[PDB]
Amino acid sequence: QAALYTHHQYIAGFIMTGAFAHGAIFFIRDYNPEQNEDNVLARMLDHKEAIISHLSWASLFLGFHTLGLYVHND
Amino acid sequence: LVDRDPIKTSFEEWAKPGHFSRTIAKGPDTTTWIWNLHADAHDFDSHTSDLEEISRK
Amino acid sequence: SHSVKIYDTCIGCTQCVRACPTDVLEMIPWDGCKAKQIASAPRTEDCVGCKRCESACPTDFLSVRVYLWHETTRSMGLAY
Amino acid sequence: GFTPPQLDPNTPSPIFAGSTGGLLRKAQVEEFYVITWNSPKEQIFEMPTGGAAIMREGPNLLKLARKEQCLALGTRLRSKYKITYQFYRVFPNGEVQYLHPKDGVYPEKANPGREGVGLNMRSIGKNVSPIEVKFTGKQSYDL
Amino acid sequence: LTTSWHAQLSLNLAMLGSLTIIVAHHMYSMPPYPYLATDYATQLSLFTHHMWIGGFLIVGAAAHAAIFMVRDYDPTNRYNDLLDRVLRHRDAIISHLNWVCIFLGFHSFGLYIHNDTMSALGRPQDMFSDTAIQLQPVFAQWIQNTHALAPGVTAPGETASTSLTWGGGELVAVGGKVALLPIPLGTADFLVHHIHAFTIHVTVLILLKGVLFARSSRLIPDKANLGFRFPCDGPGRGGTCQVSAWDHVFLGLFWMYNAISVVIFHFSWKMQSDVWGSISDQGVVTHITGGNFAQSSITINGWLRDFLWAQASQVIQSYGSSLSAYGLFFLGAHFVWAFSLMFLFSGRGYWQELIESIVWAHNKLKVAPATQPRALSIIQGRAVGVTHYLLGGIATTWAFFLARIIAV
Amino acid sequence: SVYFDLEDLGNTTGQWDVYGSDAPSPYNPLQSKFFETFAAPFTKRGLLLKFLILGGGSLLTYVSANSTGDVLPIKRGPQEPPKLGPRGKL
Amino acid sequence: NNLPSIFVPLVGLVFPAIAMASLFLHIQKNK
Amino acid sequence: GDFLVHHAIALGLHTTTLILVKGALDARGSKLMPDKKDFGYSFPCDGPGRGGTCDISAWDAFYLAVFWMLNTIGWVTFYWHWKHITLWQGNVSQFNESSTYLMGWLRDYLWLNSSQLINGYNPFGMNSLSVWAWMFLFGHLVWATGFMFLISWRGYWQELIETLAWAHERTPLANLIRWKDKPVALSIVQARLVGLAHFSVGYIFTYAAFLIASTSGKFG
Amino acid sequence: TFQVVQPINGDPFIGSLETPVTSSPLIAWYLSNLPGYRTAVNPLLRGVEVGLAHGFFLVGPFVKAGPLRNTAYAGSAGSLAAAGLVVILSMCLTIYGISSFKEGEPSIAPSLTLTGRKKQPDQLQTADGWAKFTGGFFFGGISGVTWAYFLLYVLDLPYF
Amino acid sequence: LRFPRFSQGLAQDPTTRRIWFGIATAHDFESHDDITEERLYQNIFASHFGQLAIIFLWTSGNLFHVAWQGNFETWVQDPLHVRPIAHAIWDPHFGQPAVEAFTRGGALGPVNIAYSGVYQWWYTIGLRTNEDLYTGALFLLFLSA
Numbered sequence A: 001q002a003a004l005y006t007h008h009q010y011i012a013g014f015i016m017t018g019a020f021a022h023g024a025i026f027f028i029r030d031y032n033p034e035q036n037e038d039n040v041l042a043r044m045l046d047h048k049e050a051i052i053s054h055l056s057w058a059s060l061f062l063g064f065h066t067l068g069l070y071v072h073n074d
Numbered sequence B: 001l002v003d004r005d006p007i008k009t010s011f012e013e014w015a016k017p018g019h020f021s022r023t024i025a026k027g028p029d030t031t032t033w034i035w036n037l038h039a040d041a042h043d044f045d046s047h048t049s050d051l052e053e054i055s056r057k
Numbered sequence C: 001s002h003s004v005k006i007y008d009t010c011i012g013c014t015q016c017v018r019a020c021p022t023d024v025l026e027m028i029p030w031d032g033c034k035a036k037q038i039a040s041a042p043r044t045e046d047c048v049g050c051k052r053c054e055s056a057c058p059t060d061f062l063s064v065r066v067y068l069w070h071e072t073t074r075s076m077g078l079a080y
Numbered sequence D: 001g002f003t004p005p006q007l008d009p010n011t012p013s014p015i016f017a018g019s020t021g022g023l024l025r026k027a028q029v030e031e032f033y034v035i036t037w038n039s040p041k042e043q044i045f046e047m048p049t050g051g052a053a054i055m056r057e058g059p060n061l062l063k064l065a066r067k068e069q070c071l072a073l074g075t076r077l078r079s080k081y082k083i084t085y086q087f088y089r090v091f092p093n094g095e096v097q098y099l100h101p102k103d104g105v106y107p108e109k110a111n112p113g114r115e116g117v118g119l120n121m122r123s124i125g126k127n128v129s130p131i132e133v134k135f136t137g138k139q140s141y142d143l
Numbered sequence E: 001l002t003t004s005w006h007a008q009l010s011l012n013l014a015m016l017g018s019l020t021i022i023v024a025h026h027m028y029s030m031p032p033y034p035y036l037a038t039d040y041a042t043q044l045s046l047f048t049h050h051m052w053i054g055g056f057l058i059v060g061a062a063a064h065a066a067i068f069m070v071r072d073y074d075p076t077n078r079y080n081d082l083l084d085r086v087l088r089h090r091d092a093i094i095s096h097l098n099w100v101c102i103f104l105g106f107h108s109f110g111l112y113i114h115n116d117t118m119s120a121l122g123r124p125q126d127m128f129s130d131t132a133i134q135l136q137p138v139f140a141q142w143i144q145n146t147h148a149l150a151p152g153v154t155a156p157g158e159t160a161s162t163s164l165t166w167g168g169g170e171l172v173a174v175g176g177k178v179a180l181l182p183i184p185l186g187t188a189d190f191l192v193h194h195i196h197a198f199t200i201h202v203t204v205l206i207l208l209k210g211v212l213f214a215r216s217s218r219l220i221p222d223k224a225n226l227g228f229r230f231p232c233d234g235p236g237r238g239g240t241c242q243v244s245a246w247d248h249v250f251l252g253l254f255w256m257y258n259a260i261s262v263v264i265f266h267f268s269w270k271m272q273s274d275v276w277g278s279i280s281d282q283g284v285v286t287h288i289t290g291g292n293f294a295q296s297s298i299t300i301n302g303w304l305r306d307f308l309w310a311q312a313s314q315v316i317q318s319y320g321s322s323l324s325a326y327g328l329f330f331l332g333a334h335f336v337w338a339f340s341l342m343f344l345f346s347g348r349g350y351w352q353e354l355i356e357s358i359v360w361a362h363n364k365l366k367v368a369p370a371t372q373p374r375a376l377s378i379i380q381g382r383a384v385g386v387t388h389y390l391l392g393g394i395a396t397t398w399a400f401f402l403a404r405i406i407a408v
Numbered sequence F: 001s002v003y004f005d006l007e008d009l010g011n012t013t014g015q016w017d018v019y020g021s022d023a024p025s026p027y028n029p030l031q032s033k034f035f036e037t038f039a040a041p042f043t044k045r046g047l048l049l050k051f052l053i054l055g056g057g058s059l060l061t062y063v064s065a066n067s068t069g070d071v072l073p074i075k076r077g078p079q080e081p082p083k084l085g086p087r088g089k090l
Numbered sequence G: 001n002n003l004p005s006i007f008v009p010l011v012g013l014v015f016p017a018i019a020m021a022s023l024f025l026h027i028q029k030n031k
Numbered sequence H: 001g002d003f004l005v006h007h008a009i010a011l012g013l014h015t016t017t018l019i020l021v022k023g024a025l026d027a028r029g030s031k032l033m034p035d036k037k038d039f040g041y042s043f044p045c046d047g048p049g050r051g052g053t054c055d056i057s058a059w060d061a062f063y064l065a066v067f068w069m070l071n072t073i074g075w076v077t078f079y080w081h082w083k084h085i086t087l088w089q090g091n092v093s094q095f096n097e098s099s100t101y102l103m104g105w106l107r108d109y110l111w112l113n114s115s116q117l118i119n120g121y122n123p124f125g126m127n128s129l130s131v132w133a134w135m136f137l138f139g140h141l142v143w144a145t146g147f148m149f150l151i152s153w154r155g156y157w158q159e160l161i162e163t164l165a166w167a168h169e170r171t172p173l174a175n176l177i178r179w180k181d182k183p184v185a186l187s188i189v190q191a192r193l194v195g196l197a198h199f200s201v202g203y204i205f206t207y208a209a210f211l212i213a214s215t216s217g218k219f220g
Numbered sequence I: 001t002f003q004v005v006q007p008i009n010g011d012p013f014i015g016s017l018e019t020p021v022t023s024s025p026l027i028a029w030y031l032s033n034l035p036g037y038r039t040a041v042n043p044l045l046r047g048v049e050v051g052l053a054h055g056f057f058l059v060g061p062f063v064k065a066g067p068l069r070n071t072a073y074a075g076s077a078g079s080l081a082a083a084g085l086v087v088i089l090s091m092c093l094t095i096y097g098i099s100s101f102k103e104g105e106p107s108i109a110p111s112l113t114l115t116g117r118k119k120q121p122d123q124l125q126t127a128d129g130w131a132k133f134t135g136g137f138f139f140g141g142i143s144g145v146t147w148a149y150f151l152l153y154v155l156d157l158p159y160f
Numbered sequence J: 001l002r003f004p005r006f007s008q009g010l011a012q013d014p015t016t017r018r019i020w021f022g023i024a025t026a027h028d029f030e031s032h033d034d035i036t037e038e039r040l041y042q043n044i045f046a047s048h049f050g051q052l053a054i055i056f057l058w059t060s061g062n063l064f065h066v067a068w069q070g071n072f073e074t075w076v077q078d079p080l081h082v083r084p085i086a087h088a089i090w091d092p093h094f095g096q097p098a099v100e101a102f103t104r105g106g107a108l109g110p111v112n113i114a115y116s117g118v119y120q121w122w123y124t125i126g127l128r129t130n131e132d133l134y135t136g137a138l139f140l141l142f143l144s145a
C-alpha cells in the first residue's frame, strides 16, 4: 500500500510540474497577441503582478505561522 | 619619524557614511549602497594609494 | 557564428567598439543623431559572446544586441 | 584607397626564455596569429601567455594562438607604451590575412567608405512575435 | 616584502594556521595541565576548536596571496626571477596535482566501496581488513617502536618517553579513569590517513590553481584588468562562470570544511574507542564504545551506523534536562545549513524579476520606498550561501559533540 | 633570432618528431618472416572485429553455461532449510 | 533451469559491447 | 498534528504554484529583459550587465520548482507513512503525542525506524535486507554527487580541462593517440539538468529503500 | 651563468620546455628504441613486441588477486581473465583504427626531425599500418599470456 | 553532414558538445531543419504508436516472469501466509550467505519478493493458474506486434 501510494503521488507531482512547463512553452512559442485581443487569455497577462503578489503573500503568511508554531512547540 | 596631529578628532565624519570612498559617499539611490558600505569597510588600499597612510591605518 | 545587430536608437558615443575584446565592431558615418555616427558589426565571425558591448550601452534598452548561435572554434575561445 | 602592409618574415622576436603557454597542434592544423610593432627603446612587458619579456628597439614580431591575445597585447601597448601595431592571421597552407586596423584607421574613429552591416532601421521593441516566423528558416531579428 | 602588506599577511596567516594545527596535535598527547587528560569534553573541544581555526587561517593565506598577485604584482619595477619561473610552467604543476588528486581519490575512497560491496554480497574474506587482506602502516609502527626505545639509548638523559602513546606499555589512571595509554595502528588508520592526504591535496590543488591563474589564462588573456573580485565575463566562450580568484577561495572553503570534519570525526571515534575508558580494582579497562573502531570503521555503513546513529542518541534525548540547549541547537543548525541551499542553487535574475511584482502593490498603496529595492549581487549571494553553509555544519557538529561527550 | 618563416611552416609551427628513430629493423630476418607468415590473417580490420565479437560471445557463454558449483556459489544453490518470515510467512 | 546462465551474460556483457561499438562508429562517422 | 501537517502541505503547494505561475507569466518578457521572447524558452543568461541576469529564463523557473515539488511530496509521504505505521503497530498514541514538534519527528520516525535498515550487513553477517541498505547508501551518494554540479559552475572547469590537453599532448607514448572531438566543459544549462537528475534519483532511491525495508522488516 | 632548462628546440614561443627529464641523452636513447618509436620498421613486428610485453604482464594481478586466488583453479582463471582483457583491448584498438583513419590517405605523422632534417613519415598513422599493428598486438598478447601461464603452472619453477 | 542528422548547426560543432546536445534535442520535432506541420503531426502519431507498443511489451514481460518464476498457484490457496515472488536472481558476484539469505518463499533459489500488488489484482479478476498468465503474455505480445 505504501509503495503504491508513494509511487503514484510522485508521478502526479512530476506530471503537475510538466503541465506548467508546457504552458510556459506555449506562451513563448504559440501565443498570438493579435488574434487573442482582449479575451480571457489576454487579460491575465494584464494583471500578472496582482496574482504573483497575492501568491507571495499567501505563501509568506502560511510559512511564517507554521514555522512559528512548530518552533514554539519544540 | 612621527607627524604631529595629522588628523583632527571630530564627529563630522560620523554623520556622513561612506566618507572613505568617493562613489559610496554620493548617496543611496538603491539598496546596493548599504551592502557596498560594509563590504569595503576595511579595504584600506582602495581608499587611498599612499603607503604611509595605509600603514598608519 | 553569433549574430550582432544595431538599432536606430544609436547615439554614437563609440562605447561599444572600445569595449570589444576582439575586432568585431566599428563606427561608420550616419545622419539621424547629434553625433552623426552609428555602430556596425562587419566581423561577427570573430564574436565570442562575452556581451561586453551590452554592458556599455547607455540607451535605456540596448541599441546593440548579441544573439548566441551556432558555435565554432573561434566563438568558443579554444587555443588547443 | 588603402593597401595593407606586407609581412616581413625577417623581423626579430623579443627576448623570451620560453613557457608552456605557447602554440599547440591547432597552430599546425589551423590558423595562428602574428603581431608586429615598432618600439623606440628596449623595455620589459608582460606576455599574455604568462611571464615577462623584453622587447627589442625597432621592429618586433610575435606569434600567438588567438585573436583575443594579440588584441589584448596591442591594447596594452597602445595604452602604456604609445605604440602602433598591426596583426595578421596565418593559415597552414601559407596565406597571410591582414586583420587590424583593417583600414589604417582604428575602429573607434568614424571613417568614410565603411559599409553598414547588421543595421535594423527600427527600435528593438518592434520585432515580430515568434509565431509570425514559424515553419520558416528566418528569425525575429534580421527581418 | 617591504612594500606590499598583502604578501606579509598571506605568509603570516599560513604560518599561524600551520602552528595552530601543530598545537592542536601536540596538546592532546602531552597533557600540560593537571587533571586535563581525564576531562574528555575539554580535550575534544580544544582539539576541534584549534583545528578549525588553523584551517580558516590557512584558507585566508591563499586568499591574500591571490589578492597580492592581482594587485601589487609589477615586473617593471619589482622583478623577481623565482616568481617569473613559477608562472612560466604553471600548466605542468596544475596537471601533476590533478593527476595526484585523482589517483589518491581512486586508491583511497575506492577501497571503502570495495569493502561495502564485499560485505553486502556476503564475502567478508575478500575485504581489506586485519583478518582478510591486511594493509599495515609499517612505517608509522617503526617510528613508534623507535620512540618507545628512545630513553637510555638515544636520549640517555631522559627517564621516560616524551609521550605515552608511542607504545611504552605503561598506563596512567587518575581517579578511576584512563588518562593515556599506547595507541595501536592497524588497517583502518592506513585508510583514514590516506583519506586525509587526499582531501588535503584536493584543497591545495584548488587554492594553488586559484592563485596561479589570477592574472591571465588561455581562456581570458586579460583577467587582471577585471580585478580580483568579479562574477564572470559573460556567457561567451561556452560559459565563464566563476573565473576570478575570489571564486577559488569560495570553492576551497567547502573542501577545507570537508577535510576538517573528517579529521575531527576520526579523532573522536579513535579516542572514544581505543583510549578513553574506566579502570577497575583488578586493572581491567572498559572503553566507552568497547573497541569497535578496528572492525567497524572499514566501511561507510559502519561509519553511518556505529558512529552517527549510535552516538546521536544523547543529543536527540536531551529534552527535559539541562542539556536541552544542545538539542535545540542541533535542529537550529540543521535549519541554518538547509537554508543556505537557496542562495547556492539559484540565480539573481529570478529574484530581481520577483521583486518587480512586489514593488507594484506597494506603489498601489503609496508605500513604495525611494531607495529602490535591488536583489543581491552574484558575489554577495555566493558569500551568503557559503557563510550559512559553514555556520550550519559547524554548529551541528558542535552541538552533537558537546551533547555526546558531556553525558558520557 | 628569427622564428617565423613562410617558405618553411614545419619549423614555424613546431612539427617535429622528438623521439622518432629512422634506424633499420633490429629483429632477425627469420623470426620476422615467421611472424609475418603466421600473424598475417589478423591484419584485416574488417574481419578482425567480427572474429573478436563472435569469439568473445561464444567463449564467454560456453564457460558460464557449463560452470560447476565448485566455482560459482550461485550454481551450487542453497544448502540450508529456509526460515519463516515475519507474521509466520513463508 | 539453465537459461539464466546464458541470457544474463548475453544481455549484460555482449550486447552492451556491440551496441557501444556500433554507436561510437555511427557518431564518429563523416562524409 | 494533522492540522499542522496539512497547513505545511498547503504552504508547499502554494509556493510551488507561485514559482510555476511566475515562470509562465513572465515568459514573454519583463522589465529586466523586455525582449525575452526573442531568445527562446531555454537560454543561460543575458550577461552580467544591468546588475546580473542569472537564471532569467522560464526553463530556470521550471528548474527551481522541482525542488519544491520534491519537498512537498516528501512531507506528504512522511505524514502518510508515519500515521499508517503507528496505526498498524497498534500504538496510535505515539503519533498523536510526538507529531506536534519536529524533534519528535526526527527521533520517533527517522532514527527509530532505521535500525533494521542499517543492520542489513554488519561485521558479523548479513541478511535479506542487505540490498536495501546498499541502495540507501547508493542514493545518499548520488544525492550528494548532484551538489557538485549544482554549486560549482563552468569557468572553473574549462581552465582545468585546458591543462589536461597540454599534459596529454606533451606525454611520450601517449601523444601517438589523439582525440577527434575537442574536449570542453559542460554548458551552463546542461549542468543544471545533470545536477537536477542526480538530486531526484538520489531522493527517490533513498526514500524507496528506507520505506520498503522499514515496512517489510516489521510486517513482512 | 650556466642554465639547465631551455626552450624547446630554441623556440621560446612553442608551449614546451626542455628539461633533463625530457632531453637527457640516456632518456633520449631509451625512448627512441621502444617499438612504438621505430618509424622505419614494419608495424606488425612492433605490434607483436608490444602485445607480447603487455600480455606477459597482465597474468599476475588477475592470478594473485582474483576471487579464486585461494583455490586450485587460480592460474587457469587468471589466465582466462587476462586473455579476455587482451581481447577487449584488441577490440578497442580495432575500433579506434577504423574510426580515426581513412583508406587511401597519406600518413599524418610529422616528417621533420628535431635538427631540421627531412624524413619519411611513420606508416603507423595509416589504416593499413594500424590494422597490421592491431593484428600483431592481438597475436603477441595471446602468445605472451600462454607463455606466462606455461611457465607459472606447467613448470614447477621455484618462484617467490 | 553527420550526427545529428536533424541539426545542421550542431553537426558542425568541433567539440564534444555535439554529442550531448544531439542526444538532448532528438524529440523536439519543432526545432528540426526543414520541418513542416504535417511532418510534425505524422511523427507524433508514430511516436504514440511506439509508446503503446512499449507499454504492451512491458506488461507482457511482467506476466511472463510471474508465470515462469513465481509462486502464484500456491499463493492462491493461502493468500495471507505466502510471500509473492517477482522473479529469480542469477548474480555471479553472490557469495554463499547471499544465496542462502535470498532463498525465501517456496523457491529453490534466490528470488525477489514483489511489492507491486500484481498478485492480488490478477487473483481478483479471475486468474487462477499459470496457464492463464502464459496466454495473457502471448496476447500482449501479439498486441505489441
Ligand code: CLA
Pocket: A056, A059, A060, A061, A062, A063, A064, A067, E335, E338, E339, E340, E341, E342, E343, E345, E346, E354, H015, H018, H019, H064, H067
Ligand atoms: C530549509 C531551507 C529553505 C528555507 C527555510 C526556505 C524558505 C523560503 N523560501 Mg526557499 N528554497 C530552498 C530552501 C529553503 N527555502 C531551496 C533549496 C530552493 C531551491 C533553490 C528554494 C527555492 C525557492 C524559491 C524559488 C522561492 C523560495 C521562497 C521561499 C520563502 C517563502 C516561504 C515562506 O513562507 O517564508 C517563510 C519565512 C521564513 C521561513 C523566514 C524566517 C524568518 C526568521 C525569523 C529570520 C530570523 C533572522 C534572525 C534570527 C534575526 C537576526 C539574527 C542575525 C544573526 C541574522 C521562504 C523564506 C519564495 C520567496 O522568497 O518568495 C515568497 C520563492 O519564490 N524558495
Ligand code: CLA
Pocket: B038, B039, B040, B041, B042, B043, B044, E056, E057, E058, E059, E060, E061, E063, E067, E228, E229, E246, E249, E387
Ligand atoms: C589576520 C587576519 C585577517 C585580516 C587582517 C584580513 C584583512 C582583510 N581581508 Mg581577509 N581573510 C582572512 C583573514 C584576514 N583578513 C581569512 C582567514 C580569510 C579566509 C576565510 C579571509 C578572506 C577574505 C576574503 C575572501 C576577502 C578578504 C578581504 C580582506 C580585506 C578587506 C576586509 C573587509 O572589508 O572585510 C569586511 C568585513 C566584514 C564584511 C565582516 C564579515 C562578517 C562575517 C563574515 C560574518 C560573521 C557572522 C556572525 C557570527 C553573525 C553575527 C552577525 C550580527 C550582526 C548579529 C582586508 C585587508 C577582502 C579583500 O581584500 O577584497 C579586496 C575579500 O574579498 N578576506
Ligand code: CLA
Pocket: A053, A054, A056, A057, A060, E357, E358, E359, E360, E361, E362, E365, E367
Ligand atoms: C511600513 C512599511 C510597509 C508597509 C505598509 C508594507 C505593506 C505591505 N507589504 Mg511589505 N515590506 C516592508 C515594509 C512595508 N510593507 C519591508 C521593509 C520589507 C522588506 C523586509 C517588506 C517586504 C514585503 C514582502 C516580501 C511582501 C510584502 C507585502 C506587503 C503587502 C501585504 C501585507 C503584509 O502584511 O505583507 C507582509 C509584510 C511584511 C512581511 C513586511 C515585514 C514587516 C516590516 C519589516 C515592517 C518594517 C516597517 C518599517 C521599519 C517602517 C518604519 C517606520 C518608521 C520610519 C516610523 C502590504 C501592502 C507582500 C505583498 O503583497 O507583496 C506586494 C509580500 O509578499 N512586503
Ligand code: CLA
Pocket: F053, F055, F056, F057, F059, F060, F063, F072, G008, G009, G012, G013, G014, G017, I066, I067, I076, I077, I080, I081, I083, I084, I085, I087, I088, J092, J093
Ligand atoms: C552485468 C553484467 C555482468 C556480468 C554477467 C558479470 C560477471 C562476472 N564478473 Mg563482473 N562487473 C560488471 C558486470 C558484470 N559482471 C560491472 C558492471 C562491473 C563494474 C562495477 C564489474 C566488475 C567486476 C570485477 C571487478 C570483477 C568481476 C568479476 C566477474 C566474474 C565473477 C568471478 C568469476 O566467475 O571468475 C571466473 C572468471 C573466469 C573463469 C574468466 C573470466 C570469464 C571469461 C571466460 C573471460 C573471457 C570472456 C570473453 C572471451 C572476453 C569478453 C568478450 C566480450 C564480447 C564481452 C563474472 C564472470 C570478477 C572476475 O573474476 O573477473 C575476471 C572480478 O574480479 N566483475
Ligand code: CLA
Pocket: E098, E101, E102, E103, E104, E105, E106, E109, E110, E113, E202, E205, E206, E251, E254, H141, H144, H145, H146, H147, H148, H149, H151, H152
Ligand atoms: C559526493 C559528492 C561528490 C563526489 C563523489 C565528488 C568527487 C570528486 N570531486 Mg567534487 N565536489 C562536490 C561533491 C562531490 N565531488 C561538491 C558538493 C563540491 C562543491 C561545489 C565539489 C567541488 C569540487 C572541486 C572544486 C573539485 C572537485 C573534484 C573532484 C574529484 C577529485 C579527483 C578524483 O577523481 O577523485 C576520485 C574520484 C572518486 C573517488 C569518485 C569515484 C567513486 C568510485 C571510485 C566509483 C568508481 C566506479 C568505477 C569507475 C566503475 C564505474 C563503471 C560504471 C559502469 C558503473 C572527484 C571526482 C576535483 C577535480 O575535478 O578533480 C581533481 C576539483 O578540483 N570537486
Ligand code: CLA
Pocket: E106, E107, E108, E110, E111, E113, E114, E117, E126, I061, I062, I065, I066, I067, I068, J093
Ligand atoms: C581503487 C580501488 C580498488 C582496488 C584497488 C580494488 C582491487 C580489487 N578488487 Mg575491487 N572494487 C572497487 C574498487 C577497487 N577494487 C569498487 C569501487 C567496486 C565496486 C564497483 C569494486 C568491486 C569489486 C568486485 C565485485 C570484485 C573486486 C575484486 C577486486 C580484487 C581483484 C581485482 C582484479 O582482478 O585485478 C584487477 C587489476 C588488474 C587487472 C591490473 C592492475 C594493475 C595495476 C593497475 C598496476 C599498474 C600500475 C603500475 C604500478 C604502473 C607502473 C609504471 C610503469 C612505468 C611500469 C582486487 C584486490 C574481486 C575480488 O575477488 O576481490 C578479492 C571481485 O570479485 N572488486
Ligand SMILES: CC1=C(/C=C/C(C)=C/C=C/C(C)=C/C=C/C=C(C)/C=C/C=C(C)/C=C/C2=C(C)CCCC2(C)C)C(C)(C)CCC1
Pocket: A019, A020, A022, A023, A024, A026, A027, H024
Ligand atoms: C460535487 C462535489 C464536490 C465538488 C468539488 C469540486 C467542484 C472541485 C473542484 C476542483 C477544481 C476546480 C480543481 C481545479 C484544478 C485546476 C488546475 C490543476 C489548473 C492548472 C492549470 C494549468 C496547468 C495551466 C496551464 C496553462 C498555462 C499556465 C498557460 C497557457 C495555458 C495553459 C492552460 C496550458 C465536493 C468535493 C465539494 C463535495 C462532494 C460533491
Ligand code: SF4
Pocket: C004, C019, C020, C021, C022, C024, C025, C046, C047, C048, C049, C050, C051, C052, C053, C054, C066, E236
Ligand atoms: S558579444 Fe563580446 S565579442 Fe561579440 S561584439 Fe559584443 S563585446 Fe565583441
